[PDB]
Design a protein around this ligand. Structure first.
Ligand SMILES: Nc1ncnc2c1ncn2[C@@H]1O[C@H](COP(=O)(O)OP(=O)(O)CP(=O)(O)O)[C@@H](O)[C@H]1O
Ligand SMILES: Nc1ncnc2c1ncn2[C@@H]1O[C@H](COP(=O)(O)OP(=O)(O)CP(=O)(O)O)[C@@H](O)[C@H]1O
Ligand SMILES: [Cl-]
Ligand SMILES: [Cl-]
Ligand SMILES: [Cl-]
Ligand code: NA
Ligand code: NA
Ligand code: NA
Ligand code: NA
Lengths: 316, 316
């Protein structure tokens, strides 16, 4: 008997985060000593997948890691979060992707990303995932893997009528035009928006303007997250920007909040399709805001059993 | 056991996992950059020294503390692969294995963040359980990448048993307890360490000669200051006139870890060739350290006895 399908498929990155906490950031040629080191699980794709899974989504992570200790440990992390690893591949040709992060006591950081194995996730690897993709409700992609691969995944999703949620992160100024036209929901932050559009974006009104450019490039729904100001949304049917504020909380660590938001949104798009988009975004704001109230990235992302029941009910 | 060969060189000191990312530029505050390769290597001054000695044929034992974690288990396998005893390599769940996060551009310039972690939990009770191995050694080597009190106690234990002490005050500490000098049979440091320890400007063999005498007068029996490509300068209580021992000119590939190669070669000679003159030991140690600078990769650059000329192992 054919079992429950994954409703949320994430094609994207897994990165081992190698974090050192220090009291100052080093300069060229310097050695410095920090006071704490830890390994965390990151990568935009996996962050998003994990948030959606913890909310109860059945998910499948399509990604490539290394045939190495960090890749075996990432696979176990996915499984622990009840994520299908059927299309989590391993390769000996490159190490699992890494992010080396140095963070001083003011939260300023230096980051060196080596994408590694993530970049060897190829179009044949996606084709083997075709039946899972075609049965999904939502496909989520970012800009951490090879762009040809992500383009293919969005293409495959469209061909089966699967909703596409694209997060253009990290952003680049000459993004292939297809990424706008293949996105049903296009979601980025202020700094990404500024890179994509060339406009200065430092307010919800500014984000409104930038969103309109992204819409005219061929997006259907455009969401710009705004940190503690919440998010702003527009769409082809309602092109007037709608600012969706979020209640004032005292942040502990905002790292990974955007991924929390996107994963929440993927969950809602997949399991609650009749909610209004404004409702989905209020809920996604809420969930991301819970994540900013805890340290870490993925270890901050809330589970369904710790969130209020009202986040899982149909509209009042 | 008593009639068989025991560890002649016991190193009480540090082990660090090197987390290396290759990039084309070094990042600055706030920046995220991408590199093109990530790999894991083995470092820490104590383990580096031990590895060089072992490779030259010494029977060695590494007294150190790593984490009860993957990097600790791997560090232990690295020690064993290099025929080093890990009887007193401890593992703790209370901190992670020491790490060095190293970012290296294409010119070989680097930023390095060290988190000493587990190395700082090596304590006097750990040394007490190692007391019999320490007491039976010919040479005990320590540095300053563990708690200084612990290196001091190791030095003390060695002196109580008549074991030769080789102290590398690296990285240096400006208010180093005076007892360290009185417990050091051979005190070996580099120019920049000598400057921190003495307050003198040290940028030449002649400057080093002066700083060395300051160190000798603090109570060291022998003082050696390494000088990079200029070789080393040595003095002793018996012969307080500086002797500059040059090294033949080679084309360096990577000098990282050269001082540890020199120290480990010296420990080897002190333990297995005690009838050589010191000048001879230092000529040979310069040579071996100069071999290491001609290859990439720190411990992976440290030569083995079978690849070195026969003249390095001939007797008095
Ligand atoms: N300080 C805060 N208070 C409440 N919610 C916050 C918040 N910072 C972030 N969020 C929530 O997380 C969402 C994503 O924020 P954003 O994309 O700005 O995240 P990010 O990962 O770039 C970290 P940051 O916002 O600190 O730069 C926001 O839409 C909001 O819902
Ligand atoms: N360029 C070079 N050519 C030949 N031998 C070298 C060398 N650099 C270092 N060595 C050898 O290594 C020994 C230790 O040198 P030093 O203590 O300066 O190493 P180090 O680990 O501090 C790196 P660096 O010397 O580049 O600053 C020297 O005494 C010498 O024998
Ligand atoms: Cl610190
Ligand atoms: Cl692109
Ligand atoms: Cl004494
Ligand atoms: Na983001
Ligand atoms: Na958080
Ligand atoms: Na040194
Ligand atoms: Na070298």
């Amino acid at each position: 008997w054919q079992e429950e399908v994954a409703a949320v498929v994430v094609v994207g990155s897994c990165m081992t985060d190698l974090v050192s906490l220090t009291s100052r950031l080093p300069k060229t040629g310097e050695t410095i000593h920090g006071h704490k080191f830890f390994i965390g699980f990151g990568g935009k794709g996996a962050n998003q997948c994990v948030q959606a899974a913890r909310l109860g989504a059945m998910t499948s992570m399509v990604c490539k890691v290394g045939k190495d200790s960090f890749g075996n440990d990432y696979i176990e992390n996915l499984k622990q979060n009840d994520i299908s690893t059927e299309f989590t591949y391993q390769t000996k040709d490159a190490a699992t992707g890494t992010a080396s992060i140095i963070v001083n006591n003011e939260g300023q950081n230096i980051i060196v990303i080596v994408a590694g194995a993530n970049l060897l996730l190829n179009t044949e690897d996606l084709r083997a995932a075709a039946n899972v993709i075609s049965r999904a409700k939502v496909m989520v992609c970012q800009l951490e893997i090879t762009p040809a691969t992500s383009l293919e995944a969005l293409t495959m999703a469209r061909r089966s009528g699967v909703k596409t949620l694209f997060n253009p992160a990290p952003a680049i100024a000459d993004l292939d035009p297809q990424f706008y036209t293949l996105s049903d929901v296009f979601c980025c932050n202020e700094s990404e928006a500024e890179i994509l559009t060339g406009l200065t974006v430092g307010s919800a009104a500014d984000a409104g303007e930038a969103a309109l450019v992204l819409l005219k490039r061929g997006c259907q729904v455009v969401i710009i997250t705004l940190g503690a100001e919440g998010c702003v949304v527009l769409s082809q049917t309602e092109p007037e920007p709608k600012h969706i504020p979020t209640e004032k909380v005292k942040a502990v660590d905002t790292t990974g909040a955007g991924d929390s938001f996107v994963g929440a949104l993927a969950f809602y798009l997949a399991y609650y399709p009749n909610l209004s988009l404004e409702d989905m975004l209020n809920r996604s704001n809420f969930i991301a805001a819970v994540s900013v109230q805890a340290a870490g990235t993925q270890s901050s992302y809330p589970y369904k059993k710790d969130l209020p029941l009202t986040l899982f009910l149909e509209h009042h």
